[PDB]
């Protein structure tokens, strides 16, 4: 009875109170389980790790770590656990989350509500030794770590983060995407310091989170700086605070991130300006506006090594995780690609 009654329940329900039932669903295990099975083409060996496949949710629809196991069953490659800020914080106020059904669209200023470390410590705790299975399967965790409103350090807020959560993750991230070059370079030294202390072995790989919405300066400061402190990743767009001319939805003008379709040709364009900078030389997780496994492969072939997708699943249901891999599957046979790695940076071979 899960689909059919839940495509019914999304339309009677605000946008959050539907977020938060989708949510609860996918802990629940209510969803049917993908039988697409995974095939060697689809891995991705990055981040030091080995993913099944390259299609994860992206951070923000499991804020708390509540969903991760009903994701993996979903067909995710990988998981990336909501931000999570040291303390719990409701966020903004409501209404926060609104979407624009004509544009395949959603806008949010959810404001980083979040249960905090400890809640989020406590629950990927709990299952840790699920997840140290599912990893060595090729289904790792990523979280991301994000900071308190009214907090006067960030990189404190971040660095605790690392400490708290490093231990049970595969991959961290941290946003400056929800000051100079300078502050920027001193924020993320700070993190990676607090990763290198970590006890152990298997060190979590840092990731930096950006928006789209960068000046040619900003894109080149980040580049430089993550070329510099030797970062593992970047995740290459969050949200955008513009509003494209054409949006439909009557909801346009309010104020937050917009999400889904509008954001699907800035963030390959992003993909491929970072990757450029870079030198093709750090992984990029590409994500914004992918609905489909050409959109994927757009992402891929602009040079993300891993893609992410949220809005996507608003607008077509639980179905789009598995169509996008077996699509992205078809696509790369298609244009002559062996296997996934192949065709990650394709435009910058010419
Ligand atoms: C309702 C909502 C909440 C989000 N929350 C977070 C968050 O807590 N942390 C984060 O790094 N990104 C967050 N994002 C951004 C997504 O991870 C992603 O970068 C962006 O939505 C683009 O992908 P999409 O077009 O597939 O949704 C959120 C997005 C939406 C729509
Ligand atoms: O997850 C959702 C959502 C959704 C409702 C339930 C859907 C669903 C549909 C069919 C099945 Cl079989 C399972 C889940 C999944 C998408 C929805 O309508 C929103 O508006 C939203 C806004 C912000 C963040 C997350 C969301
Ligand atoms: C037949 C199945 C009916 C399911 C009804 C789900 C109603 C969910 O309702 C939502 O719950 C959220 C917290 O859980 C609240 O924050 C939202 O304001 C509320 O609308
Ligand atoms: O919590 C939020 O508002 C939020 C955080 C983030 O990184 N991105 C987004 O679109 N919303």
């Known amino acids: 009875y899960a689909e059919y009654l839940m495509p019914g329940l999304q339309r009677l329900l605000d946008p959050e109170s539907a977020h938060r039932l989708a949510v609860r669903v996918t802990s629940l295990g209510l969803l049917p389980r993908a039988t697409f099975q995974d095939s060697d083409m689809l891995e991705v060996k990055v981040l030091g790790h080995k993913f099944r496949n390259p299609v994860g949710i992206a951070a923000g629809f499991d804020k708390n770590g509540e969903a991760v196991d009903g994701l993996y069953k979903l067909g995710f490659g990988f998981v990336e656990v909501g931000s999570v800020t040291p303390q719990p914080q409701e966020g903004n106020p409501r209404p926060r989350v609104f979407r624009l059904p004509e544009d395949q669209?959603?806008?949010n200023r959810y404001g980083f509500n979040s249960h905090g470390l400890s809640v989020v410590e406590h629950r990927l705790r709990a299952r840790q030794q699920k997840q140290a299975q599912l990893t060595a399967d090729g289904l790792p965790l990523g979280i991301n770590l994000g900071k308190n409103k009214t907090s006067e350090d960030?990189?404190?807020?971040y660095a605790e983060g690392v400490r708290t959560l490093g231990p049970l993750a595969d991959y961290l991230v941290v946003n400056v995407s929800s000051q100079g070059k300078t502050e920027l370079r001193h924020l993320l030294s700070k993190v990676l310091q607090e990763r290198d202390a970590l006890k152990g072995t298997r060190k979590p790989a840092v990731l930096v989170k950006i928006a789209p919405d960068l000046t040619?300066?900003?894109?080149?400061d980040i580049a430089s700086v993550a070329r510099e402190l030797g970062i593992d990743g970047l995740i290459v767009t969050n949200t955008t605070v513009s509003?494209?001319?054409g949006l439909q939805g009557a909801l346009r003008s309010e104020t937050g991130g917009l999400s889904g379709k509008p954001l699907r040709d800035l963030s390959t364009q992003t993909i491929r300006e970072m990757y450029a900078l870079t030198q093709g030389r750090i992984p990029i997780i590409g994500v914004g506006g992918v609905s489909s496994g050409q959109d994927a492969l757009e992402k891929i072939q602009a040079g993300a090594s891993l893609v992410q997708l949220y809005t996507a699943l608003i607008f077509l249901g639980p179905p789009v995780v598995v169509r996008v891999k077996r699509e992205l599957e078809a696509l790369l046979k298609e244009?002559?690609?062996?296997?996934v790695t192949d065709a990650i940076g394709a435009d910058h071979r010419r």
Do not use: L, M
């Open 335 to 339: 244009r002559g690609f062996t296997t």
């Open 154 to 157: 960030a990189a404190a807020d």
């Open 105 to 107: 669209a959603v806008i």
């Open 216 to 220: 040619a300066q900003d894109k080149e």
């Open 243 to 245: 509003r494209p001319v």
